[PDB]
Amino acid sequence: MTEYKLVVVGACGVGKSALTIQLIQNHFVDEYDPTIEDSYRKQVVIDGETCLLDILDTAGQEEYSAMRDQYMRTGEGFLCVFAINNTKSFEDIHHYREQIKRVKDSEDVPMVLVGNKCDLPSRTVDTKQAQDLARSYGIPFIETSAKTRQGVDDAFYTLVREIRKHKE
Numbered sequence: 001m002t003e004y005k006l007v008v009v010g011a012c013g014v015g016k017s018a019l020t021i022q023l024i025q026n027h028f029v030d031e032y033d034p035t036i037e038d039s040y041r042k043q044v045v046i047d048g049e050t051c052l053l054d055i056l057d058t059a060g061q062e063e064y065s066a067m068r069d070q071y072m073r074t075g076e077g078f079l080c081v082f083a084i085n086n087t088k089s090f091e092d093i094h095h096y097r098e099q100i101k102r103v104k105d106s107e108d109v110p111m112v113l114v115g116n117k118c119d120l121p122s123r124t125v126d127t128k129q130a131q132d133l134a135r136s137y138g139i140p141f142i143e144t145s146a147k148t149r150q151g152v153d154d155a156f157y158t159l160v161r162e163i164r165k166h167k168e
């Protein structure tokens with residue numbers, strides 16, 4: 001079966017680890033060590049086709065370094081996560097998109113924009129703001145809550161669909 005290398009990126013504390021652990025283990029982690037970067041494998045059925053997901057949950061801060069850049073080029077799709085109560089993390093999406101474009105030779109890289117923590121009432125990044133940014137990039141936007149699990153599988157599966165569309 002096909003294996004998809006997915007890379008979860010975004011600012012510190014947006015929910016990268018919580019999203020990933022909800023996908024893999026189906027529980028919510030409150031204090032997953034912010035410095036720990038690990039990969040997880042999971043077999044899933046998407047649109048009736050079984051595949052293997054190979055998911056990197058990023059945590060390191062280093063950039064513009066040959067080794068990390070070479071590794072990130074191997075990512076086939078990127079889950080670009082911000083938190084809807086963290087304006088800075090939304091603004092950082094530009095930086096993450098630029099890093100993906102910098103390291104990937106391809107001009108069209110599978111990406112999904114994820115606005116996480118949608119269970120919270122204090123929302124400083126509007127749905128429309130994020131939808132407009134996703135429309136500018138031409139990529140899907142998904143609102144998620146790792147806490148309640150809303151949209152978690154949909155975000156990852158949407159990214160796989162974006163890779164399948166790119167490879168075809």
Ligand SMILES: *CCC(=O)N1CCN(c2nc(NCCC(=O)N(C)C)nc3cc(-c4cc(O)cc5ccccc45)c(Cl)cc23)CC1
Pocket residue numbers: 009010011012013034035058059060061062063064065068069072092095096099100103
């Ligand atoms: C809690 C700690 C945590 O989760 N993280 C992960 C994200 N981190 C991170 N920080 C930065 N800082 C640069 C300052 C800046 O201007 N902004 C907007 C944050 N840079 C990161 C870069 C990358 C990254 C690096 C390379 O080399 C390639 C590449 C390709 C595609 C996507 C990202 C990258 C990563 Cl993975 C995380 C970065 C802070 C700690």
Ligand SMILES: Nc1nc2c(ncn2[C@@H]2O[C@H](COP(=O)(O)OP(=O)(O)O)[C@@H](O)[C@H]2O)c(=O)[nH]1
Pocket residue numbers: 010011012013014015016017018019029030031032034116117118119120144145146147148
């Ligand atoms: N309310 C809420 N809290 C979340 C959500 N996702 C993550 N968190 C919390 O925000 C903090 C940072 O999450 P984490 O996944 O460790 O962030 P990372 O640095 O991006 O890996 C932790 O306390 C999580 O429990 C969410 O969807 N809703």
Ligand SMILES: [Mg+2]
Pocket residue numbers: 016017018032033034035036057058059
């Ligand atoms: Mg983490």
